[PDB]
Amino acid sequence: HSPGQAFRAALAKENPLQIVGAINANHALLAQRAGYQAIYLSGGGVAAGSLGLPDLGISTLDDVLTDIRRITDVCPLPLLVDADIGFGSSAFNVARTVKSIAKAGAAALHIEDQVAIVSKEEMVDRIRAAVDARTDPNFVIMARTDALAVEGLEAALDRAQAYVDAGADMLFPEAITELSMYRRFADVAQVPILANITEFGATPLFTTDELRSAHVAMALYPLSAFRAMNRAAEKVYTVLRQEGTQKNVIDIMQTRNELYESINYYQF
Amino acid sequence: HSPGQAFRAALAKENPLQIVGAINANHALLAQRAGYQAIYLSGGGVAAGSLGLPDLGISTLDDVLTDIRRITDVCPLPLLVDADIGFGSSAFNVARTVKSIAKAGAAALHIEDQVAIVSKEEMVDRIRAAVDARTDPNFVIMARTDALAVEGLEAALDRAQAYVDAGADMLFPEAITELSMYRRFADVAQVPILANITEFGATPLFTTDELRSAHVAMALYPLSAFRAMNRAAEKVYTVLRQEGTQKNVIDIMQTRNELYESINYYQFEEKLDAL
Amino acid sequence: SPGQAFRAALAKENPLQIVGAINANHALLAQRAGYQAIYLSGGGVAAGSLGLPDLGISTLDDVLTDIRRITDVCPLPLLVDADIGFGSSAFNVARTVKSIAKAGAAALHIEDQVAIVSKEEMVDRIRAAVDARTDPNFVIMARTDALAVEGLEAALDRAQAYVDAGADMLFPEAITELSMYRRFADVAQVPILANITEFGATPLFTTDELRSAHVAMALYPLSAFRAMNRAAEKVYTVLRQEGTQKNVIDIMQTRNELYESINYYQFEEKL
Amino acid sequence: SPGQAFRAALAKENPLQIVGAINANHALLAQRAGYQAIYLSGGGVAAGSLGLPDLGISTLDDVLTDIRRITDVCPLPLLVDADIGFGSSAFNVARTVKSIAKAGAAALHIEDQVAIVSKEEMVDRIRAAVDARTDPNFVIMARTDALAVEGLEAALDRAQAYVDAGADMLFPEAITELSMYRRFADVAQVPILANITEFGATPLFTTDELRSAHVAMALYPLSAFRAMNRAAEKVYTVLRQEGTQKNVIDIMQTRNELYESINYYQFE
Ligand SMILES: [Mg+2]
Ligand SMILES: [Mg+2]
Ligand SMILES: [Mg+2]
Ligand SMILES: [Mg+2]
């Protein structure tokens, strides 16, 4: 079996492929039961959820690898991972990172040019080191760029093909506000484009149909479920503390039968 | 500063002391913000939450340690930990488990007498191996008994005495259904009594006022937040999968500002501004 | 496929010398010395990585850490001592087998240790490991001590049963005569591993002698480790006694040798 | 507390010999040999535990694992090589410092390497490390290679700034004269550590010599490790060339010596 294959196959059977972030192994199983073909391990989520830390580069590759093992050990859905800038700097750092992640169970990962961003060149080597470190060719190397917002469209598209020439299997344009931009990246890069549809950002809540008219090959929802899980956990804590009992929040609680079924308790 | 001292100080300041489970570091910080004085690491939660596996002894000590460090590295609230039966059928194991758990940052832990449960003489030896291994005396060793699920109250009360004698700092009487049962353990054990007020169990949803009348020292809610977290998560998944958009789910989502405040984001930025 | 590389080493070298590597650095020294397969001793993980006696105190986690460190830098197929599966439940053996393979190992062995469990008990453990296996090339070796315990009659029977159960190779403990390995090889009908550790009961059989015995693998679990400790103790002692390490400089690997062994310049080249 | 134990060891021995222990087993050997403090070499974690060069490839997690393994079984206070803090920001330094203490370390040293950062940058790393520390007895050592990179003046200027910033002790590199060590001790006014590693440009100073130079600590980072690698290689080569280890039996630690060092019989 090859998670890299499963991922590439998912984008093939679903367009745009809906990829939802799963904060932990339990939610990965839920996402599966909901019919999702692929999941995501958000870097911001590992920091905020697993570590209770802001997304300021305090988490480490190890924190990330732990969640990949937990998730991919029980959930077979191909897992797309946020590998940031490689957590290292040199070629062997990017390589060790890419191999670690793949070995942990990932199906794909994405590295970004955000140092402002790095030069086209340096990002080109970063991608080469990533592609070179890859053992399974089906493993997906995604290149995330923020050049559009930094250097402008022209420079953005230039990097696009540059990154693709280096071997990036897919592109991840960040902070896009207009579908047009997606079609352009698709027309130039000519590789599966990913639309990050996260909430409370500068991007509109595009629907799968809208994203399709723009040629988007993947629709990402990084923290969607996490944001809802926090609001509900907070409600439980709040009510329990005020009322001295959780009686009035039982109705918003997943039942046992539900928990057991989501984790195949009975089966064991 | 000791976490064990913090746990004990929490008890003296809140009676009964509400101890809520936090499935991860983020929720621990939420619990702290909600005003709680102590938190809990559920073994069933590590299994089902962190591993997505059933609570059937599949999780290892390492899975637990990882969650203990993550939680206690960012949240100062004393953490009570479910050490199951000691992770290891050997006395050596129990000792290494106790020391490792404390080192990971826990303030307390509870070890149980399950094998059906083991005999008194048996449980008494596990308790002794744990108290022996403990380096910091303030670190709490709570003794949990599941006798009430297959035995009568009297039988359960008997063990309670033997457990305390071995060195058990506190008692965790499982499956109690009558307020008076708590009172009897409190009067026989002579040490703080914890009441597991988890949902969908044989134990009624007793209120803090009810438990207080029964002389209960701690009120435990092991997976409460976790259960509501799962439902809401699923809701988002289902809708997003049916309507190809999360638009109709925005209203039940924690806002960016709320997320940032819970993890002290602005505070980190402040320190940078300072430089 | 690490399992595929392990089987190819078996076919290429007969008997195949499998030396223990206490850590990633020694795995590279072994590789540079020409070895085709290495070993991760469970007794090594306890005494070396944890400083604890080999009495069941280490956990699967301690072992997975060493497997990753070793396989993340050394490509040689690694045979791992998995004891009895770490746990007691078929779920534990399966989770252990998968974990070990995922960590990067090429093979592992499990024993009928509880006195030894019953044949049926072991057979189930083996079946559990074989079914948990994802890569059919990943090797599952069955270690047994039936000979000493229950005698040859029962031992030879367990052997066949283990093989019928799915064991790719056999690791029969307590053998002191080549004629006995020969017998075990004929019965089992799968590669036999001979444990040539020192300070034990088994003679220090040579690769030639083992070959004449139909032995497929020669294992040296702690050999390098034993020597590294005596040398280390020597440095600690002299330095403490004399207030300088001047007189032990001659038994030390130089910095150039260390750099060379880990390919220092090829990395700095990338940088 | 380990920090208390480290300072107690320093108070009772002059200079305090601190030998590196590559793993838990060697920590125990150092202990049986009479040492009162041991060290976890950063280059040792890389070359020994990871089989990689000391070029910034190891992560904080690799170091932490070794600290726990060693300190869980050996009570001798452990001085840890925290490199530059395993991160670029003060947040990384704080997380690194707390994690290392939590793992069981008694003290750590952080350096000004990047070329070296400006005096001001190092002053900030130290301040973050000092602020992150929860137990004042836990030692924060400042390591500097400014002597070789910038010269005497810059080195002494940095030293004083480092002490003013909160560094409990100083680890000045590249000193080749006992007389210069005295100068650093006099200007810095905090315990000075002298690195007596082999095959470098520095002399193999005896403890009596270091004492005359007012040196408070003598460090032997990989001494045992070096000898262990030569012996191990010897076994590997002879066994490969002769087809048996009969001829290297005489350089092997016996089963009883091993059992004795790990207290086998006691557990039994
Ligand atoms: Mg990210
Ligand atoms: Mg439990
Ligand atoms: Mg073994
Ligand atoms: Mg270093």
Swiss-Prot record, chain C:
Which residues does the annotation say bind substrate?
Answer: 41-43, 143, 173, 195-197, 226, 255
Q: In which pathway does it act?
A: Organic acid metabolism; propanoate degradation
Keyword Metal-binding tagged: yes
Top-level taxon? Bacteria
Listed under GO biological process in this entry are: propionate catabolic process, 2-methylcitrate cycle
Please list the reactions this protein catalyses. Answer: (2S,3R)-3-hydroxybutane-1,2,3-tricarboxylate = pyruvate + succinate
Metal-binding among keywords? yes
Role, per record: Involved in the catabolism of short chain fatty acids (SCFA) via the 2-methylcitrate cycle I (propionate degradation route). Catalyzes the thermodynamically favored C-C bond cleavage of (2R,3S)-2-methylisocitrate to yield pyruvate and succinate via an alpha-carboxy-carbanion intermediate.
UniProt cross-references to NCBIfam families, sorted A to Z? PRK11320.1 (NF008455), prpB (TIGR02317)
What else is on record for this protein? In vitro, dithiothreitol (DTT) or reduced glutathione (GSH) are required for optimal activity.
Q: Which family does it belong to?
A: Belongs to the isocitrate lyase/PEP mutase superfamily. Methylisocitrate lyase family.
Q: How does it assemble?
A: Homotetramer; dimer of dimers.
State the protein's name. 2-methylisocitrate lyase
